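Follow-up to my post from last week.
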Amino acid sequence: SVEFEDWLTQQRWYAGRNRELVSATTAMAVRLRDGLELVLLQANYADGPDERYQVIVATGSGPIDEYSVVATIGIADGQTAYDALYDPDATRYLLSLIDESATVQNVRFVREPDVELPLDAPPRVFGAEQSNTSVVFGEDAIFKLFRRITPGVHPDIELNRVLARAGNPHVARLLGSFETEWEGEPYALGMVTEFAANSAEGWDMATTSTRDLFAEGDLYAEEVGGDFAGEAYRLGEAVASVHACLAHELGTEEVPFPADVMAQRLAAAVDAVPELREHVPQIEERYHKLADTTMTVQRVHGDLHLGQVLRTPKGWLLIDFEGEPLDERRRPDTPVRDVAGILRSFEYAAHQRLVDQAGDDDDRARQLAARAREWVTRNCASFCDGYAAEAGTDPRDSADLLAAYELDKAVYEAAYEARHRPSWLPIPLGSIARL
Amino acid sequence: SVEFEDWLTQQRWYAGRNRELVSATTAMAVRLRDGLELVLLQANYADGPDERYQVIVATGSGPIDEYSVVATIGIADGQTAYDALYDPDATRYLLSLIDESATVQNVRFVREPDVELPLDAPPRVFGAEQSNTSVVFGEDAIFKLFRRITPGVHPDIELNRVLARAGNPHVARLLGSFETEWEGEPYALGMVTEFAANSAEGWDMATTSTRDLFAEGDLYAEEVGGDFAGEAYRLGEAVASVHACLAHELGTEEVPFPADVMAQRLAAAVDAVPELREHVPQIEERYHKLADTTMTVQRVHGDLHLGQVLRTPKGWLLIDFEGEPLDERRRPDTPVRDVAGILRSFEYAAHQRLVDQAGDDDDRARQLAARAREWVTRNCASFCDGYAAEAGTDPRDSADLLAAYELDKAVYEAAYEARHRPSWLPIPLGSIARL
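User reply:
Got it. Predicted complex:
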């Protein structure tokens, strides 16, 4: 009996920052401990579909004082209710429960065949995606509560298991997890995984190389010290490694190019039409060219971009197998979609900078474009080269299949950008024109 | 009728965190507005004298929505009650009452002959003393709502009013106050003052000049660019200005040196004895030398050190007339005690650094001591020179009176340091040996 309303809309994992949330009270409460309670809250909004968020709620006192605002929830007849992801004693016990590995009533915990890192110091971690909030024990293990529960299974655990038991190097090794069978279906609630302390994002690392050419430019893409090409090639065989390993356990099948399905995507994209309608016949000509042709479908990442890729010493890591309709997310697909995602991300890394270099106006942005096109096409080459070096198959060798998915990822990029951010529209439109 | 007991021990201005309280109920309530209410709450413990805290309570909605945490007091059927300090429209009013300058029932709000700064964007300052909370309207003025009410007269206000009405350029012009005569004695509940934007502490400014000589040293105290001597001289005539101006309105009296009183101080100091007992006969010889001699007593600061002094563009400012037994604090004293405080503070500024330069070991700290003694004695000279340049009287001219109070301030410094911090003890002991 605690009015979440007020703080369940301050958090930065809450989706409906625009949605107008009418009352949003509990839909489940398992008493994990005398102090804790795994509360799964249901959020009813006028003019929307209900969303379900989870929160491990603690009472008593919720320090530190360095965390009152973010964590304090409300009065609780008559102790103070906050959330336990900010109580180091209460996080220790959640992690112990995952090692037992116990089952408190409905919420069932489960650990792999490893050795977890308890009696180690935990703080929260601050890059809080709308998916999640997460504490890190020591520098050894990182626990992650999935904030918005959608019915299991959950690929990010499903894949990191099959991929780590197979012993793929490119994966943050999974340790434990926990879920619950609310109503009909299961619900993956969180996972804990080996901690890649000393990491850096791919986008952040490409952004610094794209920064290099451009600043003090007019000196060639290959000649500059910042050259990402070598690192891009390594990232290629990294993504190819996980793909080939995933295909071994997941298996492969043959299916024809989703002509009518991907036509429906390009058709709906024309709803928020620009000059995209002018390209549409030329695009449709590229689509119906590959009609009645068979591809190979594996289990894949589903949402690859430089952001979902981390660099540690001694290796590239693939994370966030989100992937993005949970049924549709698990469905297999051509790996040409994943290499399309990375190649798509390279152009965005190079030209956000050029927009930030149109920032940054006025006279000769024409030089920067020349360097960006150089950089964009060179690391895409270096990436494909490295991918092809790992598995016998070369993605560019079967170019027509790839060029289709690149065009599709641009149509989804246009619509996803155009609605949210008008300034982006030149990036999808120009790149559509480039291909 | 809101139940405070549960959150008036949660605020961290609450004194009795280690007292153990019983019924902590309200003992006054003047309704300032429709939404507001000045409420002096009385805390009745068992085994410990009662205290009294205040809190202006607002009822309705309480945003900012990010601050319902440190605010939400209780649910008084049926509107929520919370403290108004986290409300900008409610402090705008608490200020517009001090400007009125109104008087609601018991609580009288007074203002000086100035113009306060309402309709100016306010936030609360997180540097919140166990005495206070405070909001800061723009870069213009700073309100300060005393959280615990001890019975007047709060001499920091009494000595600020007198000085600013006198038109002293060396203070933080007092803009308004407010108070109430509860039971018998009066209670000063708050004050608002001219906000010194673009300021810097004296200690922080001396620390940077003491940093200069020492780093890249062996180059003389006068030759280095960092030389504080010029600024010290200005600070001299600044302190002398307020003293002479204070004596005009406060008046002067003649009294003999507190031989038996200051003997009791040196006697109690010997309780936590070191080598201080060896100096004690030589110190007592300096004390009983000035016995049966008359001095001049004015109203004074009482607690001068470089920390209680601020520098703005176009002038030095004296703040925190704390001063430090409220009866004893208001009692007049020789201004030689205040110049003793500043000269005492110069040595601490120079040798904290030398301890931080013993930090910072090992071979030739003997060089740093040579520079420190140079710096300590030169800015003490420059300060006394500037003081003497303002008022006809020179403090060093009547040296014996000053040398006594310097020795006393060292005995209080030794005992105050020794109990709290053992590492300090060489500073008082060595300086006692120096004088």
